[PDB]
Amino acid sequence: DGAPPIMGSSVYITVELAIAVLAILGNVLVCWAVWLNSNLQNVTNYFVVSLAAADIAVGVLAIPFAITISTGFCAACHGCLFIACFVLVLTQSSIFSLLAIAIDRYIAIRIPLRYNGLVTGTRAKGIIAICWVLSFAIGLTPMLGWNNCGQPKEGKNHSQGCGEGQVACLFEDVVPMNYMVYFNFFACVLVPLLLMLGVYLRIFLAARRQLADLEDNWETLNDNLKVIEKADNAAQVKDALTKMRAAALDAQKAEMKDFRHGFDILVGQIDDALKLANEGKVKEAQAAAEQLKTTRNAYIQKYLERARSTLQKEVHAAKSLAIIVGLFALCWLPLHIINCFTFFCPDCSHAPLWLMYLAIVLSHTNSVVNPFIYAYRIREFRQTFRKIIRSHVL
Ligand SMILES: CC(C)CCC[C@@H](C)[C@H]1CC[C@H]2[C@@H]3CC=C4C[C@@H](O)CC[C@]4(C)[C@H]3CC[C@]12C
Ligand SMILES: CC(C)CCC[C@@H](C)[C@H]1CC[C@H]2[C@@H]3CC=C4C[C@@H](O)CC[C@]4(C)[C@H]3CC[C@]12C
Ligand SMILES: CC(C)CCC[C@@H](C)[C@H]1CC[C@H]2[C@@H]3CC=C4C[C@@H](O)CC[C@]4(C)[C@H]3CC[C@]12C
Ligand SMILES: Nc1nc(NCCc2ccc(O)cc2)nc2nc(-c3ccco3)nn12
Ligand code: NA
Structure with missing residues (x-):
């Protein structure tokens, strides 16, 4: 019986909305730049655009969903699950795009002569569509039956005054923690991240050997x-x-x-x-x-x-993209690690609410940072940003 909950809620909602605005604006700019500049229209940047589309959807959909689910409103449990799990679809799509970018740069430095005949736009487009379908299947797996809808919190559901078939829509009440830890974290996030680490290691080793x-x-x-x-x-x-x-x-x-x-x-x-x-x-x-x-x-x-400066350019570009993978891990690992403590240490007190929502906010700010990495590290993006801003604004 302490501070009124609406005060802390106002801070959280305001921050989330500020993040949504920046995620939309910066990633719209990325897509606009690729549309405008034919030097940016290559296979690698098609996955960049797919990644930007996922980050736009974080601001347009996932963040409004996150605000909604924090109220604990009464909802049919499968409607609750879709609200709770949709962000995992977008996060899984980001994983696939980052993995495809790594393999693309690996193919480019390992067999550059065969690159253009093996990695085409038509095949890339098909790979992207398949990865979006798989992202829905992975992210919405709890809706297929792996959920807690069959074991509702009756105390909470009567306190909030929910009707029949309704639950108080709270993430940790409807989404089982063994799915979150074993299936989502270990298999679907941690394993691809380690693969990306290995591929980038191979990229830098091949460049060092060729030089x-x-x-x-x-x-x-x-x-x-x-x-x-x-x-x-x-x-x-x-x-x-x-x-x-x-x-x-x-x-x-x-x-x-x-x-x-x-x-x-x-x-x-x-x-x-x-x-x-x-x-x-x-x-x-x-x-x-x-x-x-x-x-x-x-x-x-x-x-x-000339061959040496081409290899140095590929190393510099691969480092720029690896930063993107590192910042993704930075923003998402706290939430996964908190879930591990909740799951594996029942003797531990649950992480406090303010830390839960700080970690949720942190994972959302990842949808803001990539346009900044492009502007600072990739000249062709920076110059196209400048032209767009100068021309189509001032
Ligand atoms: C912008 C476009 C993509 C449409 C967005 C679809 C969203 C807004 C729709 C699609 C399915 C909908 C949910 C489906 C069922 C329920 C259960 C009900 O007891 C409360 C509303 C709730 C939770 C809905 C909320 C809004 C919802 C998530
Ligand atoms: C990836 C980088 C940023 C490292 C992230 C470290 C964070 C996520 C770690 C460091 C210390 C950890 C906390 C230390 C101890 C406790 C008390 C326990 O009762 C609940 C978990 C909780 C609250 C941990 C949650 C996760 C935690 C906050
Ligand atoms: C960089 C990669 C490997 C990050 C993965 C590190 C994870 C898997 C590790 C780092 C710290 C670990 C936690 C540290 C301490 C405890 C308390 C114990 O009573 C239950 C296990 C638990 C909760 C561990 C679970 C696994 C854990 C979260
Ligand atoms: N554990 C968790 N909780 C929430 N929201 C609920 C926070 C909470 C936790 C306890 C409580 O009593 C009331 C609210 N969102 C969450 N998102 C994630 C997540 C997404 C991807 C990886 O972890 N985990 N996660
Ligand atoms: Na993302």
């Missing part, structure tokens, strides 16, 4: 070259030539590219120097191999810098 190979081929080119100018035997020169030749066509594997001309001059100049070396013409081999360094300084170095 290391590039550097080893480059040093192999210049080491064997320095050995050429120092040798005094015909076969000693031919040995540094054959090892320079393998590294040559090795780096070649890493019609609108004038780069094959650079590698054909290089490999042809090596073979010329090889034929001299086999004929004992040492000094001719050493002089014919000395013109390699201008072919290197006019073609090979230009292509090994």
